[PDB]
Symmetry: D2
């Protein structure tokens, strides 16, 4: 698991469950290729998106469907979605945790990059 | 101003000056059309991007070139840019402030929406 | 102003109005001495807390009464208050802006420090 | 483990290791009693601070010595420390995760409160 996504809800102080996540990779065409997707589970995590073989250097985009999450709760949100765009670079083994902290009119995203 | 962007630097405790910002509007073809651009000035703000007449209902993207900002300081940051995507003016004209707080591996963005 | 406090609400996308703020300075006895207080006004700001002459070197505490803010809105929040503690003016006089972004279970605080 | 503390470094995109944490409980005297302490480990977590028997309803303070952490890295920080003050309330089983995201001039803190 070189790539993990974790989503938290700052209004309720809870993991954000059932949030759709889409991952894209920038293709030679300079367009965004579907790469992986999933919905967050009870602890607000999405595991198993990819494997070390497939997760080669490149530019990746992580799209989190925050608007549907707030709409389920009855809260009118500002953003259409939250996007995280980054380069993956070989340099030691790397694991990536992309964390997102959600409010209706604000979000924070942080990357924790560790080397096992 | 109907649209104002404010950018702060969490490492130095200072406004983020000379940050490039590009604004796009989603067209009828579902492509992103260039709408306005500029660079933050010394208080970390960008004003004058649009007028009330031009700033019609639509889906807008604000792209903040964070990577160039950190590289000019000697830091290799995680994100390629910070992107904020939102529906604007769909219940009438509003005034939008988009704020971004920058760190090398993390950013936060908040919207303040007022009714003129 | 040598000291300004700005408070935003991440749930509503709005400045946080009528929030009580108390400022304390650490005394020679290591107790917290009351220094200034006030309430945020409609743009979410509190000005006029002190003067350059009064705002000497020291350790200062800014206490933001977040709990009362959320309770007046019907929400039972996690934190009792938000506290910001910092050394001020130790290399000469500076101008401080203390910003706080509020959600029910999360808050962020940032300092912007400028040299007059 | 009803209480866990997790500390992240937004400059380096890493867990914040060896950060001192002190936990206090508000005593009948209305003063702060030492309750638990520790230093964060490699994944930036502090476990084992207390037990369900001892963690009764009350007001608790968590103090994170952020200033020493930045000083070790050669970065001049703004805050003396980060403080988190909250009430623990019986109402179902509750576990508390206090998360802190650190930058030199900014920090965020979030509570994730779950019921097993």
């Amino acid at each position: 698991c070189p790539l993990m996504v974790k989503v938290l809800d700052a209004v309720r102080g809870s993991p954000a469950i059932n949030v759709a996540v889409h991952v894209f990779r920038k293709a030679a065409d300079d367009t965004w290729e579907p790469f992986a997707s999933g919905k967050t589970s009870e602890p607000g995590e999405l595991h198993g998106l990819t494997t070390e073989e497939e997760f080669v250097e490149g530019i990746y985009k992580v799209e989190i469907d925050t608007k549907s999450y707030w709409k389920a709760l009855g809260i009118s949100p500002f953003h259409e979605h939250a996007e995280v765009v980054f380069t993956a670079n070989d340099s030691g083994p790397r694991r990536y945790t992309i964390a997102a902290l959600l409010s209706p009119y604000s979000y924070s995203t942080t990357a924790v990059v560790t080397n096992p």
